[PDB]
Ligand binder design. Sequence first.
Ligand SMILES: O=c1[nH]nc(-c2c(N3CCCCC3)nc3ccc(Cl)cc3c2-c2ccccc2)o1
Length: 134
Amino acid sequence: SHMCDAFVGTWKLVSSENFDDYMKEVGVGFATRKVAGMAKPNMIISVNGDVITIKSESTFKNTEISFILGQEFDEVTADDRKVKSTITLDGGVLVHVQKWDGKSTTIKRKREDDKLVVECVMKGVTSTRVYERA
Ligand SMILES: O=c1[nH]nc(-c2c(N3CCCCC3)nc3ccc(Cl)cc3c2-c2ccccc2)o1
């Protein structure tokens, strides 16, 4: 078994702060921001050996990434950016960096009490999204 153990499960969005502003800073257009911002996704995290899979299921888009910690991969984001992503496990936090067009955003996923707290940062703008077990 593993420490990445505390992330496995089906996590439903329960609260969001500043996500519209984060998306604006990322470069997401009006209509996509509106529709994406409405969604209440489930974030489904599973582990099989060294491979971690994170699925996002929602009324807007269903997305999935599978990766090995520390090993860069291709990701197409829900807003259709083509990004180069690397995910590491640092001090018990999953740290996800996306690079594209000379830009960068960092997404951290942390267990706090019975929640999964996700912090997304694009320059000075941070959004916090809180998820609970489904
Ligand atoms: O699992 C989920 N919850 N939220 C997302 C998520 C996201 N996340 C946040 C959680 C951590 C990984 C990054 N970044 C986005 C960036 C641009 C756009 Cl237009 C949408 C998203 C979305 C997204 C939102 C609503 C419906 C589907 C997807 O992915």
